[PDB]
Amino acid sequence: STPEVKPLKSLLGDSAPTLHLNKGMAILFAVVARGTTILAKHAWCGGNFLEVTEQILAKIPSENNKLTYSHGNYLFHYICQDRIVYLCITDDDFERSRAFSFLNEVKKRFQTTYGSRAQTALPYAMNSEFSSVLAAQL
Amino acid sequence: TPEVKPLKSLLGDSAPTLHLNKGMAILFAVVARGTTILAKHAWCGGNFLEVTEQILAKIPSENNKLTYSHGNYLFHYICQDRIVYLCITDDDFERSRAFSFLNEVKKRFQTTYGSRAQTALPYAMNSEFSSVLAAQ
Ligand SMILES: [Cl-]
Ligand SMILES: [Cl-]
C-alpha cells in the first residue's frame, strides 16, 4: 500500500528549505519564427520542444494575436505581430515568469536588430546572435 | 491577459509529448548514505543538492518509506540498510509510480554495489549509476 505523505515542515520546521529550479524562472524554451520557419531559438533545459512547437506554428493564424495554450504541466504563450511569432513555453511548477512581458522585450530587440529582414531569412538565419539575446532577456 | 485555451482545441487529441525528463516527470533522483550522495541525476537545473542535503541530514537511518510535501513538490524516499533512495516530483505525480521507480532503483543499486555502499566515497557510483537512474 502506498506510503504516507507528510509535510516537510514536520521534519525540519518552518525553515524547511525551498527549491528554486531553472534559475528561479518558468521559461524552458523560446523561439522567433515566421509561419513554420524558426529563425532563432533557445532552450533552458533538454526537452523535445521543437516538434510540438512546429505543430503549433503550423496551425496558428498569421494575423496579429496573443494567446496561451495549456497542455499537461506547460503553457505555450505567443504573440504574433506582422506575421512574426514570438513563442515561449512555461513550466506550471516553477516560479512565476511574466511570459508576455518577456515576449514583448524579445520582439522589441528582434524588430530593432533585424526588422523586416525577418520576413525573408532562412530557418535559423539569426540563431547564433539572437539565441544569447533570448538567454539574456531572462 | 490573453485568453488561455486547451492545446487540444488547436491540435486535436495529442498524446504524451513534453519531457524535461526524456520520459517520466521525475525532476531529481539520488542515492545517499547519511548525507553522502553516491549517485544523482537531475532533469533540469536548480538547487536540488543543497535542498536535498538538508532533508537527508535529518532523515533517520531506519528502514522506512515516506513522501514529504513542500510547496509545489513531493520528496519520496525509501531507506533500506542505511541507504536512502530519493526522488522529487511535483504534486500532480502519481505517488505509487514514484515508489515503483525507487524500488526498481534500489534493486539494481543493491545487486550492483552490494555493501560497498557503506564505505564508498561521495559520487563513487555516479558515472556508472546516473545513467540507469536516467533510464526510467
Ligand atoms: Cl520546495
Ligand atoms: Cl497565461
Residue numbers in the entry:
A (entry chain B): 20 to 157
B (entry chain A): 21 to 156
The authors write:
In order to increase artificially the apparent concentration of the two components and thus make crystallizing a complex of the two more likely, a cDNA encoding the fragment of Hrb mapped as binding VAMP7 longin domain (residues 136–176) was cloned onto the 5′ end of the VAMP7 longin domain cDNA. Following removal of the GST tag, this chimeric construct was crystallized and its structure was determined by SIRAS with a single mercury derivative (Experimental Procedures), because attempts to solve it by molecular replacement using a variety of profilin-like fold proteins as search models failed. The chimeric construct crystallized with four molecules in the asymmetric unit, with the fragments of Hrb binding to each longin domain in an identical manner but with two being intermolecular and two being intramolecular interactions. As expected, the VAMP7 longin domain (residues 1–115) possessed a five-stranded antiparallel β sheet, flanked by helix α1 on one face with helix α2 and a truncated helix α3 on the other. The first 20 residues of the Hrb fragment (residues 136–155) are disordered, and only residues 156–176 are visible in the density. These sit in a hydrophobic groove that wraps halfway around the longin domain and have assumed short stretches of defined secondary structure on binding the longin domain. Residues 156–159 of Hrb form an additional β strand along one edge of VAMP7 longin domain strand β3. The Hrb short β strand then gives way to a single-turn α helix (residues 160–167) that is flanked by proline residues, and contacts the longin domain via hydrophobic interactions using predominantly three leucine residues. Residues 168–176 of Hrb pack against helix α1 of VAMP7 longin domain, with the interaction again being mediated by hydrophobic side chains and also one hydrogen bond between Asn24 of VAMP7 longin domain and Thr170 of Hrb.
VAMP7 and yeast Nyv1p (Wen et al., 2006), along with the yeast and mammalian orthologs of Sec22 (Gonzalez et al., 2001) and Ykt6 (Tochio et al., 2001), comprise the “longin” subfamily of R-SNAREs because they possess a 120–140 residue N-terminal, profilin-like, longin domain (Filippini et al., 2001) that is also found in other proteins including the σ and μ subunits of the AP2 clathrin adaptor complex (Collins et al., 2002) and the SRα subunit of the signal recognition particle receptor. We demonstrate that the clathrin-mediated endocytosis of the SNARE VAMP7 is directly mediated by Hrb, a clathrin adaptor and ArfGAP. Hrb wraps 20 residues of its unstructured C-terminal tail around the folded VAMP7 longin domain, demonstrating that unstructured regions of clathrin adaptors can select cargo.
